[PDB]
Design an enzyme around this catalytic site. Structure first.
Site, mmCIF file in Angstrom:
data_model
loop_
_atom_site.group_PDB
_atom_site.id
_atom_site.type_symbol
_atom_site.label_atom_id
_atom_site.label_comp_id
_atom_site.label_asym_id
_atom_site.label_seq_id
_atom_site.Cartn_x
_atom_site.Cartn_y
_atom_site.Cartn_z
ATOM 1 N N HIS C 143 -4.574 -34.946 -19.731
ATOM 2 C CA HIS C 143 -5.442 -36.366 -19.750
ATOM 3 C C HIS C 143 -6.729 -36.113 -20.415
ATOM 4 O O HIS C 143 -7.541 -37.264 -20.686
ATOM 5 C CB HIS C 143 -6.097 -36.598 -18.202
ATOM 6 C CG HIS C 143 -4.860 -36.797 -17.309
ATOM 7 N ND1 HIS C 143 -3.787 -37.696 -17.630
ATOM 8 C CD2 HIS C 143 -4.554 -36.130 -15.951
ATOM 9 C CE1 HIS C 143 -2.941 -37.731 -16.638
ATOM 10 N NE2 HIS C 143 -3.288 -37.012 -15.652
ATOM 11 N N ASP C 180 4.861 -34.031 -16.569
ATOM 12 C CA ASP C 180 3.948 -34.134 -15.357
ATOM 13 C C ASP C 180 4.019 -35.655 -14.957
ATOM 14 O O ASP C 180 4.353 -36.516 -15.644
ATOM 15 C CB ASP C 180 2.497 -33.885 -15.910
ATOM 16 C CG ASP C 180 1.324 -33.869 -14.834
ATOM 17 O OD1 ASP C 180 0.969 -35.287 -14.501
ATOM 18 O OD2 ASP C 180 0.902 -33.199 -14.331
ATOM 19 N N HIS C 182 2.019 -37.990 -13.954
ATOM 20 C CA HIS C 182 1.049 -38.847 -14.488
ATOM 21 C C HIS C 182 1.180 -38.942 -16.243
ATOM 22 O O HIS C 182 1.614 -38.156 -17.026
ATOM 23 C CB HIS C 182 -0.334 -38.147 -14.022
ATOM 24 C CG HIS C 182 -0.186 -38.018 -12.581
ATOM 25 N ND1 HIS C 182 -0.473 -36.711 -12.150
ATOM 26 C CD2 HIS C 182 -0.430 -39.010 -11.592
ATOM 27 C CE1 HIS C 182 -0.582 -37.005 -10.872
ATOM 28 N NE2 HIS C 182 -0.519 -38.144 -10.450
ATOM 29 N N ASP C 268 4.044 -32.150 -10.282
ATOM 30 C CA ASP C 268 3.653 -33.384 -9.428
ATOM 31 C C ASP C 268 4.707 -34.414 -9.274
ATOM 32 O O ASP C 268 4.449 -35.302 -8.206
ATOM 33 C CB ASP C 268 2.240 -33.702 -9.664
ATOM 34 C CG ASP C 268 1.870 -33.771 -11.264
ATOM 35 O OD1 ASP C 268 2.743 -33.884 -12.039
ATOM 36 O OD2 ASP C 268 0.721 -33.934 -11.383
HETATM 37 K K K Z 1 3.993 -37.651 -18.056
HETATM 38 ZN ZN ZN Z 2 -0.380 -34.753 -13.143
#
Ligand code: K
Ligand code: ZN
Ligand code: K
Ligand code: K
Ligand code: K
Ligand code: K
Ligand code: K
Ligand code: K
Ligand code: K
Ligand code: ZN
Ligand code: ZN
Ligand code: ZN
Lengths: 370, 376, 370, 376
Positions: C143, C180, C182, C268
Site C-alpha cells: 500500500h 493480499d 486488499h 488476509d
Molecule cells: K491484492
Molecule cells: Zn491486506
C-alpha cells in the site's frame, strides 16, 4: 458497619502508556511484549473493582464518582506550564513526561479525573457524608513533584486533595501514612517545611527512588519533626510492618493528633509484586488498616481516606485491596485469600525478624518516640 | 573461543497450562486474566531466544535439538504409572498433575522433549562435541519427584539426564549447582543417599517449597555430606550470592572433584521476579557462571552444562540468560542491560550485607568447609 | 524437491505500533485493549515462523537474512525527506506516519530490514542461488506510496526490490501478482505507466482502500494494459479465487511472458480474518502458489519470489503460509490444517458461485483475455 | 423516556475456557497464543459494559442482576445427567463438553447465572418492571441443545427463560428473532413442532453450523410455519439485513402477533468479526432494534427483551451493543462510531445488492409472506 464511600470512575482504567516491558520502554534491546505492557496497567486496578463487585462488597459501600480536578485545584500544587506541557504531550498521542513517567493518548484528562476522585474523597469525609473513604485514583500520585512527573505519577493526587480540603474546610492537622512500598517523595517534598501535615513513609530501603533510605530526613525548620521515613530492609514482611506500625507510626500519630488521616495505599509490598522485594499478604494490609482506622477514631473522629497508589501484581493486588475495604467498612465478604497461608510460610526467620526489630527500636529512639 | 552447544527446540515453547493468574488456578475468587496466564509462560523463555537471535549470539553457538527422552530414560527415575497418568491427562486436554503442577494439552510430549534436551546436552559435553552447553529445557525439572510433579516441573530433567549419562558414559562424579531461587528438592531427594552426585542449592530461605530452609539436611548415610543447602535471607542480592559462591559452593566443589558440573539455572533470583524476593542483576548471573566455568575447567576438563529452570520476569530474564550464555561462550555481544545500574542502587545496605555475610561464614563452618583457594 | 530460500530476520518481529484496538487508535471512545494491540501484530508472523520450525520444514529450506535496505535502494522509490520524516518520528518513540500507518520506536530501522529481505530475495533468485524464495517482510509494503505511508506499510518493499533488481541484473519483464485481500495500490501507482512490470491485484471489492474496485484502471499510455484489478465480491472463497486465477491471472501472465514473478502474498483473504470478508483456506493458498509456480516454470525459468504482506488471524495465517512454503519447496510436512474441512462447508452456494463466475467471465472479456 | 432494564453481573465475565487460538483447541499443530485465547473471551463483553459506563448510558438504565437459574428452571430444557456431567467437568477444572463447547473451572455456576439473567429479564418485562430489557448473558445460549452443548453455548438461555416465563406468567405467544450471524439451531430444535414460539434466524448461509442453510426448514406439524431461516449470502451487509427485516421478519411478526419479543442478539455480523463474513455497522444494529421495538410496541405492549449472544471483535462489538441499548432506551450518548463511515464504503455494490434482494423476494414468496404495512 461503618459508612464507607468508594470513589471510582471507569475512565481511570482507560489510561495507558505506550509499549513497555514491565517498566522498560520498548525499543533498543527491549522486545515489545506479546501481551503485557507497562507494569502500571489497567488490570492491576480493574481486577480489584471486579473482585469488589463479585464479592458483593460494592453493594455495601457508598459508590461515588466525582468531577475532574479543576485548574484551580491543580494549580495549588502544579504550575500552568506543567499542565500545558502534559496536555500537549497527551494530545500528541503520549510519550515520556519524565523519568519512569510515560503517558498515553488522553492521559491528561484521565489524570485530572484521578486527582478529582482524591479531592472528592477527602471532601466527603470532612463533610460527614461518609465515615471513611477509598479512592481508586489511577494514575497514582505520591511520587509526583510540582513540576516533575515521576514513578508513573503525573499529578500529586494527595497533596492536591489536601490543599483543596484546607481551602474548603480549614482542616489544620492532616497525617499522611504512605505504605506504598516505594518512598512517598512527592508528599515529602511538598510538606517538608510544614507542621500542618505529618508525612510518614514506610518503604523498602533504596527501592524507589533508587538508593534512597531517608531516615535522617525528618523535615526542616517549621517542619522539623513532621516527616518520618522508615526504610525497611528488603525481604521483610508482616512482622517488619507490624513492628513499624507499633513502634513508629502509631506513636507518631498519637503525638501529632491528626484531624484527618490520609493513606497513600500502594499494595506493592505484597509478596508477589515485581516492583519490590517485600512479603506482605492481605491480612497485613487488613491489620495496617485496622491500626490506622483505630488511630483515626482516637484523634480524627474516624476521618480516614485511603487513596490507591501502586501495586503491580494482577493476581494478588485484588485480595489486598479487598482486605483494606472490608476493614474500612467493617463488612466481611465471603472472599478467602488463596495465597495467605503460603505467604505466611515464606516469612523471614526469627534471626532476620530480630535484626529488623532491633533496627526499628533504634529508629524509634532516633525519632524520640521511645 | 570455546565451543558452546545451545540445545533448543521451538516445541518447548508450546507447553501451556490452563488458565491461571500468576500461580493461582482460575476459578472461585480468582478472575481469569485478560492476557497473562500461568507465570511459567512461553514468553519468559521465548524472549531469551529472541534476544540471543537479535544480539547475534545464536549465530556464534552450536544450535542443536535432540530427540525426546525415551521411556527407558524416563523410567530410570519415574514409574510407568506416572508416565501413564501424565499422558492420559495430557491427552484429555490437561489439568492438574499435583499442587502447583498444571499441564496442558500435549504437555506430555513436550515434557519428554525438555528432558531429551537435557539428556543430549550432557551427552554432547561428555562426548567432547562441545566444551559446554546450555539447554533451554522447558518445562523445568528441579522440583519434580519420581512419582510427584511439583512446582511447574513434570519430569526430573537433570536427574534423568544424569542417570542416562551414567548408563552411556560411566561418569562417576557429577556436581549439580542449583541457583534457581527455589529449593532444588527433586534433585536433593533423588540423590540424598548418593555420593556420586553432589547437589548444592542456593535458594531464598522458605520460598518454595514454602517454609523450607534445609541447612541441616546434608544427605544421609552414603550421601552424608553430598547435599548442601544455602538458605539465603529474602531481600539479598549480588553480594549475598557472591559470598555464598566463595565461602560454600567453590570449597564444596573443590573437595568433590566433579567430572562434570551441571547448573540448574533458574533466573528467578532476578530483582524484578514475581516469584521470589531476591535482588540479582545480569552481572550476578555472569559472575556465578564465570566461577562455575572456572571450577569446571580446573576439575572436569571444562565440562559444564547449564539447564534452564525458573525465571518469571518476561522483561528481565532475557538479559540474565544472555549474560550466562555470553560467559559460557566467551562471546560478548553489544547488548547493554538497561536495568543493571538501577538494580545496583537497590542492593542491601552494609549492615544487611554484613548480617548475611556472618551467617554464611557460620554456615561454611557448620558444613566443615575449608576456605581453600582455587588450584589445578 | 526445489531449492527454496526463506528470508527471515527476528528483528522484523520487534516492530510495534502504539496502542490500538484492531485498527483503531486508542483514545477518545476506544478503550486500550487488555492484551491485543494493533492488528498488524508480531504474532501474526511469528506464529508462521514457529510452525515452520515445529513442522521441521525450516530444515528443508535455505534459511537466509540480509542487510537492511541501503539509502540508495530506498531512494529509487522514496524521497530523502520521507526517509527523514520517518526516522524522526521513529526516533521520537513513534506515532502516525499516515492514515492507518502507525509506527513505533525503532520502526524506521526495522522497516529498512523488511525492505532489505525483499531486495535480497529477488537477488538470490535472479542470481540462481535458489529456485524460488519466500521473504517474511514485516512491516508490509504493497500500500505504500513513494511519499505516503498507508495501510500499515512504510516502504514499498516489492517496488524497492524490483528497482534494485533492474539496476543489478537488468531483468526486463516482471509480473507482480498481489493476492493480499486488499488492493495493491502502491504497486499499481508506481508502475501504472510502465510495460516492464505487469501488476495484477486480486482483492475484495471496496475493502481497502475503502470503496475502490478498479476494474477499469488498466494502466495508462506506455502502461496501458499492464495493470489488472480483479475486484471480487465480498464473501467469496476458493472457487472465486480459482476462477480468477484460471480466467484472468494465468492468461495475463501467458501474454506478458514474465522473466520473474513476484507475489505480494497477504493471507488476509483467509476465512477467519478480521480485516476482510473472504473465505479462503490453506489449500486455496496452496493452489494459487502451484498455479503461479507453474506459470513461473513456463515463462521465467522457475523464478518466483513470494513476499509476505497482510494476514491478521493469529490462529490461521500460520497454516496458510505453511501451505505456500510447502508448495514452493515441493516438501509436504506432517502438518494438517485443522480448519480446512470446516471452511470447505462454509463456501458460497452454487447460485452465488455462478454469479461471481459470470462476472469474472465478463471481466476476462473486458481485459481481452477470452 | 422508556425504562430499560440492563441485566448484568460481573461474574459472567469470569467464565473462561482452556487455551484456544480463536476457536482452535491448543495442542498438536496449534501453538498456544501469547495473549488472546478463546474467541468467546471476557473482553468481547467487558468492553461493551465499559463503554456503556463511560458514555453515561449505564447511569440512565435500570441496572439489575438476578439469582442463577435453579435446577427446576434448567430441567425444563436439560436432563439431570447433563447438569451432572457439566458440573463434574467444571469442578475438575474444565475441558470439552462437546465439539466447539469448551468450558473452564467454575463455568457451571457461571452458565447458571447467564441463564438466570435471561430468565429475570423476561420476568421483569412481563411483570411491567421495565418497558424493555437487555441481558448480558455470557456464556451464550442459542446453539445449545437439550443434551448437547454446542457453539460456545452450555445452556439454552432463551429457551430456559421462555419455559420459565410460561410457567410463571402464562404468556402464549413469544417471537424469538435471532440476528446473531450464526444459525439459532438450539432455539429452532426446541420449538420446531411448537406454534407458541415463532423462531426466526437471520444468518450467514452455511457459517455455523457449517454448511447449514435451512430455508426449507419451516417447522413441522403443529409448528409448521413457526420457524423461519433467512440464509443470507456471505459478504452481505446493511442492505441485505434491512431487506430481510422488511420482507421477511416484519411480515412474519405481524402474522404471529407476539405477546413478547425476544432478540437473540449476537453482534458477529459486524464488518470486522473473525467468525463470520458479513458487513454490518453499528447503525445496522440500531435500525434492526428500532424495527423490532416498533413491532413490540404494536403487538406486545412494548415488551421486548434483547439477550446477548455472539460477537467476537473486541474493538467493534462495543459500538454495536451501545447502538442497540441506545435504541432500547431512547437515550442517545455522545459516542460516535469511528468505523461507521469506513464500513459504509465497503458495502456490496449495486449488482450484488440486487442479487441478494431478488433472493429475499423469492424467499418471502416461498414462505407465503404477504408484504403488509405495519399497523396497530
Ligand atoms: K491484492
Ligand atoms: Zn491486506
Ligand atoms: K511509602
Ligand atoms: K511535613
Ligand atoms: K536452588
Ligand atoms: K547427594
Ligand atoms: K504496469
Ligand atoms: K441467527
Ligand atoms: K416454532
Ligand atoms: Zn509504589
Ligand atoms: Zn524457581
Ligand atoms: Zn454467533
Amino acid at each position: 458497619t461503618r459508612r464507607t464511600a468508594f470513589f471510582f470512575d471507569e475512565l481511570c482504567l482507560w489510561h495507558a502508556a505506550g509499549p513497555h516491558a514491565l517498566t522498560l520502554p520498548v525499543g533498543g534491546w527491549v522486545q515489545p511484549p506479546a501481551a503485557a505492557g507497562h507494569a502500571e496497567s489497567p488490570e492491576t486496578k480493574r481486577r480489584l473493582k471486579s473482585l469488589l463487585d463479585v464479592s458483593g462488597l460494592t453493594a455495601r459501600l457508598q459508590l461515588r464518582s466525582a468531577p475532574p480536578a479543576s485548574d484551580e485545584d491543580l494549580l495549588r500544587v502544579h504550575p500552568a506550564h506543567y499542565l500545558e506541557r502534559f496536555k500537549a504531550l497527551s494530545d500528541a498521542g503520549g510519550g515520556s513526561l519524565g523519568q519512569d513517567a510515560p503517558i498515553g493518548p488522553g492521559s491528561y484528562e484521565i489524570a485530572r479525573l484521578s486527582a478529582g476522585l482524591a479531592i472528592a474523597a477527602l471532601d466527603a469525609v470532612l463533610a460527614g457524608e461518609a465515615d471513611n473513604a477509598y479512592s481508586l485514583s489511577r494514575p497514582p500520585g505520591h511520587h509526583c513533584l510540582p513540576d516533575q512527573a515521576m514513578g508513573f505519577c503525573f499529578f500529586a493526587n494527595i497533596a492536591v486533595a489536601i490543599e483543596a480540603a484546607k481551602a474548603r474546610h480549614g482542616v489544620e492537622r492532616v497525617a499522611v501514612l504512605d505504605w506504598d512500598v516505594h518512598h512517598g517523595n512527592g508528599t515529602q517534598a511538598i510538606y517538608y517545611r510544614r507542621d500542618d501535615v505529618l508525612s510518614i513513609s514506610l518503604h523498602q530501603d533504596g527501592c524507589f527512588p533508587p538508593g534512597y533510605s531517608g531516615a535522617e530526613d525528618i523535615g526542616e525548620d517549621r517542619g522539623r519533626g513532621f516527616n518520618l521515613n522508615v526504610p525497611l530492609l528488603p525481604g521483610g514482611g508482616h512482622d517488619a510492618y507490624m513492628q513499624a506500625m507499633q513502634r513508629i507510626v502509631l506513636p507518631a500519630l498519637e503525638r501529632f493528633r491528626p484531624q484527618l488521616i490520609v493513606v497513600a495505599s500502594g499494595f506493592d509490598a505484597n509478596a508477589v509484586d515485581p516492583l519490590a522485594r517485600m512479603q506482605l499478604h492481605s491480612d497485613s494490609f487488613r491489620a495496617m488498616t485496622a491500626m490506622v482506622r483505630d488511630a483515626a477514631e482516637r484523634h480524627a473522629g474516624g476521618r480516614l481516606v485511603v487513596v490507591h497508589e501502586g501495586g503491580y501484581s494482577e493476581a494478588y493486588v485484588p485480595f489486598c485491596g479487598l482486605a483494606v475495604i472490608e476493614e474500612l467498612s467493617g463488612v466481611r465478604s465471603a472472599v478467602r485469600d488463596p495465597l495467605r497461608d503460603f505467604i505466611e510460610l515464606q516469612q523471614p526467620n526469627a534471626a532476620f525478624r530480630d535484626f529488623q526489630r532491633q533496627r526499628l527500636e533504634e529508629l524509634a529512639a532516633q525519632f524520640g518516640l521511645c
